[PDB]
Amino acid sequence: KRYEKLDFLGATVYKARDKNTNQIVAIKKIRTALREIKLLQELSHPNIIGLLDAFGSNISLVFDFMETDLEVIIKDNSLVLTPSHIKAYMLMTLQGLEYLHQHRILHRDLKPNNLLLDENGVLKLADFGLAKSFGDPNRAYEHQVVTRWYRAPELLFGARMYGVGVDMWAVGCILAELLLRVPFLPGDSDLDQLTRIFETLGTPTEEQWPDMCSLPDYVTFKSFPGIPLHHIFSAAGDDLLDLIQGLFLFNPCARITATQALKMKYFSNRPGPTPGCQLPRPN
Numbered sequence: 584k585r586y587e588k589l590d591f592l593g594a595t596v597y598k599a600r601d602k603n604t605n606q607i608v609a610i611k612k613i614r615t616a617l618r619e620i621k622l623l624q625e626l627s628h629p630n631i632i633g634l635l636d637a638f639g640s641n642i643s644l645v646f647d648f649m650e651t652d653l654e655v656i657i658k659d660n661s662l663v664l665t666p667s668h669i670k671a672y673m674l675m676t677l678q679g680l681e682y683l684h685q686h687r688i689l690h691r692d693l694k695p696n697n698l699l700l701d702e703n704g705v706l707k708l709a710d711f712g713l714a715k716s717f718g719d720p721n722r723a724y725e726h727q728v729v730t731r732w733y734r735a736p737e738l739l740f741g742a743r744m745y746g747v748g749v750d751m752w753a754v755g756c757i758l759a760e761l762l763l764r765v766p767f768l769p770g771d772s773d774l775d776q777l778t779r780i781f782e783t784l785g786t787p788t789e790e791q792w793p794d795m796c797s798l799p800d801y802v803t804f805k806s807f808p809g810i811p812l813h814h815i816f817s818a819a820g821d822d823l824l825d826l827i828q829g830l831f832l833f834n835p836c837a838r839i840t841a842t843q844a845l846k847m848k849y850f851s852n853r854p855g856p857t858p859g860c861q862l863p864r865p866n
């Protein structure tokens with residue numbers, strides 16, 4: 584309507600120019616979008632993508648333009664991530680997520696390519712296509728799960744009741760991927776995803792996860808010992824290992840929350856988070 588289509592980016596996404604401010608934006612063109620406009624229009628947090636406008640003739644959602652995303656950074660061999668880089672990305676991720684959870688919203692699709700980065704190193708959660716108020720019902724056969732590699736074990740065992748844990752597990756997978764620069768648990772099937780979770784983190788005992796055997800799709804895997812976190816992340820300090828451990832607890836009620844994650848010593852310890860403007864950018 585009042586936007587000129589500049590470059591194509593990848594539903595269909597275009598770069599554009601707002602003729603009011605001459606501001607550069609991203610326009611996403613196509614009931615998935617109804618629920619999205621509802622939440623996103625009224626939210627406002629630096630680390631949550633802003634919905635600037637919408638119009639219907641199909642639906643077009645107008646978003647802040649973000650020059651890159653975490654997956655691009657992770658896959659870019661010319662960039663080396665320092666401990667301070669990783670700390671900055673996690674802090675922005677968790678502050679965004681803490682906001683959402685305080686507003687009783689689950690993202691439900693956290694993965695590196697949904698953490699967008701602007702030219703000033705501001706990270707923003709995006710793609711609220713699966714986002715849900717905590718108390719909304721979970722559909723029978725149209726149930727929307729994150730891509731498998733970021734997916735919490737309770738979801739892989741068919742949980743219909745879940746909460747904050749699904750996002751926090753994903754956040755642990757994103758952290759692991761920042762550290763390893765490859766996906767942490769790349770399952771090739773939903774069963775193989777559980778296999779990989781268990782042979783890496785151990786097959787849960789009933790005291791680690793009391794209610795596991797009563798999940799709708801529970802089945803008996805072999806007992807795997809797991810691998811010590813300090814062996815997997817050989818460059819991570821004890822403070823980072825404690826955060827990673829908290830994010831991958833099997834019991835979704837024991838798993839660390841965004842708020843608890845942000846209060847951990849990791850975030851107050853040296854080295855500090857990289858200022859956004861010094862974060863490494865694809866050249």
Ligand SMILES: Nc1ncnc2c1ncn2[C@@H]1O[C@H](COP(=O)(O)OP(=O)(O)NP(=O)(O)O)[C@@H](O)[C@H]1O
Pocket residue numbers: 592593594596608609646647648649650651696699710712
């Ligand atoms: N706000 C934005 N600013 C700049 N580029 C963007 C923005 N949002 C999306 N893009 C780009 O457009 C592409 C469209 O991909 P997209 O379809 O959003 O991801 P997807 O996970 O494959 N499907 P979807 O469910 O639509 O997210 C992305 O990979 C980005 O490179």
Ligand SMILES: [Mg+2]
Pocket residue numbers: 696697710
């Ligand atoms: Mg996406």
